Design an enzyme around this catalytic site. Structure first.
Site, PDB file in Angstrom:
ATOM      1  N   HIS A   1       0.845  -1.194   0.000  1.00  0.00           N
ATOM      2  CA  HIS A   1       0.000   0.000   0.000  1.00  0.00           C
ATOM      3  C   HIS A   1       0.876   1.238   0.000  1.00  0.00           C
ATOM      4  O   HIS A   1       1.142   1.829  -1.090  1.00  0.00           O
ATOM      5  CB  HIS A   1      -1.058  -0.056   1.040  1.00  0.00           C
ATOM      6  CG  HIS A   1      -0.870  -0.494   2.449  1.00  0.00           C
ATOM      7  ND1 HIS A   1      -1.908  -0.290   3.400  1.00  0.00           N
ATOM      8  CD2 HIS A   1       0.139  -1.059   3.168  1.00  0.00           C
ATOM      9  CE1 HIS A   1      -1.502  -0.700   4.577  1.00  0.00           C
ATOM     10  NE2 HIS A   1      -0.265  -1.155   4.485  1.00  0.00           N
TER      11      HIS A   1
ATOM     12  N   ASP B   1      12.175  -5.771  -3.121  1.00  0.00           N
ATOM     13  CA  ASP B   1      11.268  -6.363  -2.122  1.00  0.00           C
ATOM     14  C   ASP B   1      11.293  -7.852  -1.961  1.00  0.00           C
ATOM     15  O   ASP B   1      11.417  -8.633  -2.906  1.00  0.00           O
ATOM     16  CB  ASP B   1       9.841  -5.921  -2.589  1.00  0.00           C
ATOM     17  CG  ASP B   1       8.875  -5.952  -1.438  1.00  0.00           C
ATOM     18  OD1 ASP B   1       9.317  -5.760  -0.269  1.00  0.00           O
ATOM     19  OD2 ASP B   1       7.684  -6.193  -1.711  1.00  0.00           O
TER      20      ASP B   1
ATOM     21  N   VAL C   1       9.338  -0.525   4.719  1.00  0.00           N
ATOM     22  CA  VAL C   1       9.397  -1.960   5.055  1.00  0.00           C
ATOM     23  C   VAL C   1       9.382  -2.094   6.541  1.00  0.00           C
ATOM     24  O   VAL C   1       9.669  -1.106   7.268  1.00  0.00           O
ATOM     25  CB  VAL C   1      10.721  -2.443   4.382  1.00  0.00           C
ATOM     26  CG1 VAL C   1      11.904  -2.195   5.271  1.00  0.00           C
ATOM     27  CG2 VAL C   1      10.500  -3.810   3.883  1.00  0.00           C
ATOM     28  N   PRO C   2       9.051  -3.248   7.068  1.00  0.00           N
ATOM     29  CA  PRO C   2       8.867  -3.462   8.479  1.00  0.00           C
ATOM     30  C   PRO C   2      10.141  -3.577   9.279  1.00  0.00           C
ATOM     31  O   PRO C   2      11.209  -3.886   8.782  1.00  0.00           O
ATOM     32  CB  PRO C   2       7.944  -4.671   8.632  1.00  0.00           C
ATOM     33  CG  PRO C   2       7.527  -4.956   7.204  1.00  0.00           C
ATOM     34  CD  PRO C   2       8.662  -4.438   6.302  1.00  0.00           C
TER      35      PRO C   2
ATOM     36  N   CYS D   1      10.384   7.159   6.930  1.00  0.00           N
ATOM     37  CA  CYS D   1       9.120   7.579   7.595  1.00  0.00           C
ATOM     38  C   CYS D   1       8.435   6.320   8.091  1.00  0.00           C
ATOM     39  O   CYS D   1       7.189   6.275   8.127  1.00  0.00           O
ATOM     40  CB  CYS D   1       8.225   8.324   6.599  1.00  0.00           C
ATOM     41  SG  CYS D   1       8.673  10.082   6.384  1.00  0.00           S
TER      42      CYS D   1
ATOM     43  N   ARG E   1       9.632   2.615  10.366  1.00  0.00           N
ATOM     44  CA  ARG E   1      10.014   2.268  11.789  1.00  0.00           C
ATOM     45  C   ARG E   1      11.343   2.933  11.979  1.00  0.00           C
ATOM     46  O   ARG E   1      11.894   3.383  10.924  1.00  0.00           O
ATOM     47  CB  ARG E   1       9.894   0.820  11.942  1.00  0.00           C
ATOM     48  CG  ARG E   1       8.381   0.386  11.964  1.00  0.00           C
ATOM     49  CD  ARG E   1       7.993   0.339  13.406  1.00  0.00           C
ATOM     50  NE  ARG E   1       6.575   0.087  13.618  1.00  0.00           N
ATOM     51  CZ  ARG E   1       6.222  -0.623  14.729  1.00  0.00           C
ATOM     52  NH1 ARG E   1       7.209  -1.040  15.516  1.00  0.00           N
ATOM     53  NH2 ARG E   1       4.947  -0.800  15.024  1.00  0.00           N
TER      54      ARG E   1
ATOM     55  N   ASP F   1      10.824  10.900  10.460  1.00  0.00           N
ATOM     56  CA  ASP F   1       9.507  11.078  11.082  1.00  0.00           C
ATOM     57  C   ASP F   1       9.396  10.010  12.209  1.00  0.00           C
ATOM     58  O   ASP F   1       8.582  10.019  13.067  1.00  0.00           O
ATOM     59  CB  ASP F   1       8.386  11.005  10.117  1.00  0.00           C
ATOM     60  CG  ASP F   1       7.013  11.109  10.765  1.00  0.00           C
ATOM     61  OD1 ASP F   1       6.636  12.223  11.213  1.00  0.00           O
ATOM     62  OD2 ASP F   1       6.336  10.037  10.806  1.00  0.00           O
TER      63      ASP F   1
ATOM     64  N   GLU G   1      13.142   7.403  20.365  1.00  0.00           N
ATOM     65  CA  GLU G   1      12.004   8.238  20.385  1.00  0.00           C
ATOM     66  C   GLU G   1      10.967   7.946  21.433  1.00  0.00           C
ATOM     67  O   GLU G   1      10.373   8.926  21.972  1.00  0.00           O
ATOM     68  CB  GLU G   1      11.350   8.255  18.944  1.00  0.00           C
ATOM     69  CG  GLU G   1      10.269   7.298  18.708  1.00  0.00           C
ATOM     70  CD  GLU G   1       9.511   7.186  17.449  1.00  0.00           C
ATOM     71  OE1 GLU G   1      10.059   7.058  16.327  1.00  0.00           O
ATOM     72  OE2 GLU G   1       8.235   7.093  17.507  1.00  0.00           O
TER      73      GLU G   1
ATOM     74  N   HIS H   1       6.841  11.628  14.319  1.00  0.00           N
ATOM     75  CA  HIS H   1       5.904  10.572  13.955  1.00  0.00           C
ATOM     76  C   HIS H   1       4.569  11.208  13.577  1.00  0.00           C
ATOM     77  O   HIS H   1       3.538  10.993  14.169  1.00  0.00           O
ATOM     78  CB  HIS H   1       5.714   9.512  15.008  1.00  0.00           C
ATOM     79  CG  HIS H   1       5.736   8.116  14.477  1.00  0.00           C
ATOM     80  ND1 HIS H   1       6.922   7.654  13.895  1.00  0.00           N
ATOM     81  CD2 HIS H   1       4.849   7.126  14.365  1.00  0.00           C
ATOM     82  CE1 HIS H   1       6.762   6.384  13.510  1.00  0.00           C
ATOM     83  NE2 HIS H   1       5.513   6.033  13.794  1.00  0.00           N
TER      84      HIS H   1
HETATM   85  N1  LIG Z   1       6.297   7.194  10.294  1.00  0.00           N
HETATM   86  C1  LIG Z   1       5.069   7.131  10.846  1.00  0.00           C
HETATM   87  O1  LIG Z   1       4.411   8.092  11.212  1.00  0.00           O
HETATM   88  C2  LIG Z   1       4.425   5.697  10.948  1.00  0.00           C
HETATM   89  C3  LIG Z   1       5.056   4.881  10.044  1.00  0.00           C
HETATM   90  N2  LIG Z   1       4.550   3.577  10.010  1.00  0.00           N
HETATM   91  C4  LIG Z   1       5.271   2.657   9.020  1.00  0.00           C
HETATM   92  O2  LIG Z   1       4.888   2.845   7.649  1.00  0.00           O
HETATM   93  C5  LIG Z   1       5.554   1.689   6.824  1.00  0.00           C
HETATM   94  C6  LIG Z   1       4.746   1.550   5.614  1.00  0.00           C
HETATM   95  O3  LIG Z   1       4.184   0.246   5.468  1.00  0.00           O
HETATM   96  P1  LIG Z   1       3.770  -0.582   4.184  1.00  0.00           P
HETATM   97  O4  LIG Z   1       4.537  -0.061   3.041  1.00  0.00           O
HETATM   98  O5  LIG Z   1       2.314  -0.732   4.119  1.00  0.00           O
HETATM   99  O6  LIG Z   1       4.372  -2.098   4.583  1.00  0.00           O
HETATM  100  P2  LIG Z   1       4.203  -3.563   4.087  1.00  0.00           P
HETATM  101  O7  LIG Z   1       2.904  -3.714   3.287  1.00  0.00           O
HETATM  102  O8  LIG Z   1       4.410  -4.509   5.245  1.00  0.00           O
HETATM  103  O9  LIG Z   1       5.458  -3.677   3.099  1.00  0.00           O
HETATM  104  C7  LIG Z   1       5.216  -3.875   1.619  1.00  0.00           C
HETATM  105  C8  LIG Z   1       6.122  -4.949   1.189  1.00  0.00           C
HETATM  106  O10 LIG Z   1       7.256  -4.999   2.231  1.00  0.00           O
HETATM  107  C9  LIG Z   1       7.685  -6.304   2.156  1.00  0.00           C
HETATM  108  N3  LIG Z   1       8.626  -6.565   3.170  1.00  0.00           N
HETATM  109  C10 LIG Z   1       8.504  -6.997   4.476  1.00  0.00           C
HETATM  110  N4  LIG Z   1       9.636  -7.214   5.118  1.00  0.00           N
HETATM  111  C11 LIG Z   1      10.608  -6.959   4.250  1.00  0.00           C
HETATM  112  C12 LIG Z   1      12.067  -6.984   4.428  1.00  0.00           C
HETATM  113  N5  LIG Z   1      12.705  -7.300   5.526  1.00  0.00           N
HETATM  114  N6  LIG Z   1      12.730  -6.618   3.281  1.00  0.00           N
HETATM  115  C13 LIG Z   1      12.182  -6.286   2.104  1.00  0.00           C
HETATM  116  N7  LIG Z   1      10.801  -6.245   1.894  1.00  0.00           N
HETATM  117  C14 LIG Z   1      10.041  -6.577   3.010  1.00  0.00           C
HETATM  118  C15 LIG Z   1       6.479  -7.245   2.104  1.00  0.00           C
HETATM  119  O11 LIG Z   1       6.771  -8.535   1.826  1.00  0.00           O
HETATM  120  C16 LIG Z   1       5.611  -6.432   1.192  1.00  0.00           C
HETATM  121  O12 LIG Z   1       5.651  -6.914  -0.236  1.00  0.00           O
HETATM  122  C17 LIG Z   1       5.566   0.560   7.905  1.00  0.00           C
HETATM  123  O13 LIG Z   1       6.557  -0.332   7.567  1.00  0.00           O
HETATM  124  C18 LIG Z   1       5.479   1.151   9.284  1.00  0.00           C
HETATM  125  O14 LIG Z   1       6.366   0.812  10.248  1.00  0.00           O
HETATM  126  C19 LIG Z   1       3.549   3.150  10.824  1.00  0.00           C
HETATM  127  C20 LIG Z   1       2.950   4.030  11.683  1.00  0.00           C
HETATM  128  N8  LIG Z   1       2.456   3.556  13.509  1.00  0.00           N
HETATM  129  C21 LIG Z   1       3.741   3.712  13.878  1.00  0.00           C
HETATM  130  O15 LIG Z   1       4.061   4.705  14.569  1.00  0.00           O
HETATM  131  C22 LIG Z   1       4.558   2.597  13.930  1.00  0.00           C
HETATM  132  O16 LIG Z   1       4.097   1.477  14.217  1.00  0.00           O
HETATM  133  O17 LIG Z   1       5.790   2.731  14.099  1.00  0.00           O
HETATM  134  C23 LIG Z   1       3.364   5.389  11.808  1.00  0.00           C
END
Ligand SMILES: NC(=O)C1=CN([C@@H]2O[C@H](COP(=O)(O)OP(=O)(O)OC[C@H]3O[C@@H](n4cnc5c(N)ncnc54)[C@H](O)[C@@H]3O)[C@@H](O)[C@H]2O)C=C(NC(=O)C(=O)O)C1
Ligand code: NAI
Lengths: 337, 337
Positions: free
Chosen positions: B156, B176, B207-208, B234, B236, B260, B265, B297
């Site tokens: 997404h 990815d 990514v996570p 932006c 983790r 961010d 933090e 954040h």
């Molecule tokens: N900065 C903020 O305010 C907050 C940030 N977040 C964070 O936003 C990212 C975005 O997530 P998203 O792109 O949707 O992640 P996924 O759908 O899980 O990833 C897409 C593809 O990633 C692949 N993938 C998983 N693991 C790996 C590795 N190790 N290497 C390569 N590719 C990988 C997967 O297979 C998918 O195809 C998110 O990551 C998040 O942390 C969230 C907000 N709440 C927070 O404050 C927070 O929890 O920290 C706020």
């Protein structure tokens, strides 16, 4: 052996001149730092044509100051031409050229980002940080993807501006005198301004400083706008009535504003007033508004343009120096708005 | 009639509670300022449902404290459920609903803007105006259009950031675990990450925070990295190695960094430290670096997100009160980790 002498070569121009000299093997190329002065004109010694960027005047005087040195070959790095003695210039047979287009992108680019920063509330948020107020409430931002961006004007620049916001996934509405047969096919065009002025959340001007257009944004245009509109004018300053927007800002009508061009700009802009008595207050009250972004005509100032700047210049001159047909000879008769 | 009682309602949420109530004509709705605690839990007296967001745990007791006022249908307005008493919840057989996604656009939007910003050197300009240097040279901006942007992570969010950057017209590269068969076809993927760290100019982490990714950007990742790179995290924080980055920022390998998210933090961010001693000194040294962009954040803090937070929340809950199959039943998965 060929000679071109450059005037007003910024450090940021340095490297571009290289790549062009770097490649242009056979020509002799040298610049310098002082603007071309009736006095400096002289260093242009036995070099064919001169490349010089300048807003300062090449008086009927510095013409011969340079003429006698051995050159009638002069080309600007800039878009401008009204700063040269055009009449004594021909009295003299002086051959000038202009470099009219350095990346329309940097300007389109520059407004999107300023626009987008005002919707986000990035400056309010950045103020809290500086003060060390690290929490996010309630400095919430509006999403680009959620506004209705109206573009006033549809040329090179503005089209870009269109595609960028399109990319944010927003709704673009457009306006022009000349409904580009193409864009209007997709329905972008509204019948009139009074239409875009009341369904647009963001308004980015991209239209020449016309006699007609002079102060299109004012108490009257504004009172038709939505509430909490955002106004962007990275084009020509006179399009807006400053005291008017100011007012709109004062009541909460205008949500924010972006100004990289001001009306009483000339003289004030681009001068280091630091350590001096600041010369123009509302501009100064504008600069500091937290929901305003002022910039000093920087929309254009970019690696890619400048490269254009310099280069579309060394060429045009090489064409002068060599006797070949250049690009946009200094007369550019009714090419301009 | 019906009754829904809501807790911990920010002023900014306030405004959307109404467009909802304003719709849901037959239900009474009411809310509180402070969080819910056994103390408070009474307050939702008679309210068939309770809507609520908070970080304080819904400790063991807080529940019956709720239970006794007559309610067991509670739905969170945010993602996380690791601050709820699953067993009691279950010993209680309480029914809950989280709210999993609140505008992913918000995050890819905020990252793309911050990057463009650093890319263009806006901060340095704005620091200039403030002191009042209305001249532009040499705070030359680089165009997003001229860059190669490497998206690490393609879900997404990273997807959306991808689109925007192409709106700008940049060359977008991705990387990815699971090479989405669709983008991969259009040839965006790169085989390995070291591919990415060397043709890429801007890099955006999406990514996570996986034991595996936990410090991808450290002193080795960087050195692969290109001169003038721009790092953008932006997601983790643990993913970046703050000291790695400063060293890179210090040396000059790094053009700009945008943050961010910060690993050290929890505890600092979301605190008003104004007028108190600032708790973390790199964090601050960074906040103020001409070319860093720190934000707390905040990538999700948007009108759209906070809107679904509420709306998606009250909805799903009404499906609770009403007795329907709603969205996001949180199943008592004992292990809150
Ligand atoms: N900065 C903020 O305010 C907050 C940030 N977040 C964070 O936003 C990212 C975005 O997530 P998203 O792109 O949707 O992640 P996924 O759908 O899980 O990833 C897409 C593809 O990633 C692949 N993938 C998983 N693991 C790996 C590795 N190790 N290497 C390569 N590719 C990988 C997967 O297979 C998918 O195809 C998110 O990551 C998040 O942390 C969230 C907000 N709440 C927070 O404050 C927070 O929890 O920290 C706020
Ligand atoms: N702020 C800065 O650094 C600089 C700003 N500029 C501005 O950037 C803008 C972008 O430039 P271009 O695309 O070349 O302009 P343009 O004039 O080609 O703009 C698009 C269209 O507007 C036109 N137009 C003229 N008067 C109009 C009116 N009253 N109503 C509607 N359309 C009208 C055309 O016919 C044209 O196709 C300019 O309008 C100019 O004022 C230009 C250089 C630097």
């Amino acid at each position: 052996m060929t000679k071109v002498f450059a005037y007003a070569i910024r450090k940021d121009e340095e490297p571009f001149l290289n790549e062009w000299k770097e490649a242009h093997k056979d020509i002799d190329v040298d610049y310098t730092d002082k603007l071309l002065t009736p006095e400096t004109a002289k260093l242009a010694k036995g070099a064919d044509g001169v490349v010089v960027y300048q807003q300062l005047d090449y008086t009927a005087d510095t013409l011969q100051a340079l003429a006698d040195a051995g050159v009638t070959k002069m080309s600007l790095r800039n878009v401008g031409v009204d700063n040269i003695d055009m009449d004594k210039a021909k009295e003299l047979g002086f051959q000038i050229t202009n470099v009219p287009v350095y990346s329309p992108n940097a300007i389109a680019e520059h407004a999107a980002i300023q626009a987008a920063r005002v919707l986000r509330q990035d400056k309010r948020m950045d103020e809290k940080m500086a003060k060390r107020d690290l929490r996010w409430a309630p400095t919430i931002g509006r999403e680009v993807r959620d506004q209705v961006v109206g573009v006033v004007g549809t040329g090179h620049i503005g089209q870009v501006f269109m595609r960028i916001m399109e990319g944010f996934g927003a709704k673009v509405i457009a306006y022009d005198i000349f409904k580009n047969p193409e864009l209007e096919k997709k329905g972008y065009y509204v019948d009139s301004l009074d239409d875009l002025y009341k369904q647009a959340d963001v308004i980015s001007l991209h239209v020449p400083d016309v006699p007609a257009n002079v102060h299109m944004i004012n108490d009257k245009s504004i009172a038709e706008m939505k509430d909490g509109v955002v106004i962007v004018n990275c084009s020509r300053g006179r399009l807006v009535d400053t005291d008017a927007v100011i007012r709109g800002l004062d009541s909460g009508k205008i949500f924010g504003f972006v100004m990289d061009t001001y009306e009483d700009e000339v003289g004030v802009f681009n001068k280091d007033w630091e350590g001096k008595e600041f010369p123009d207050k509302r501009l100064a009250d504008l600069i500091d508004r937290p929901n305003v972004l002022v910039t000093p005509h920087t929309a254009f100032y970019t690696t890619h343009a400048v490269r254009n700047m310099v280069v579309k210049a060394f060429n045009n001159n090489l064409k002068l120096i060599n006797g070949e047909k250049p690009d946009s000879p200094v007369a550019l008769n009714k090419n301009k708005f």
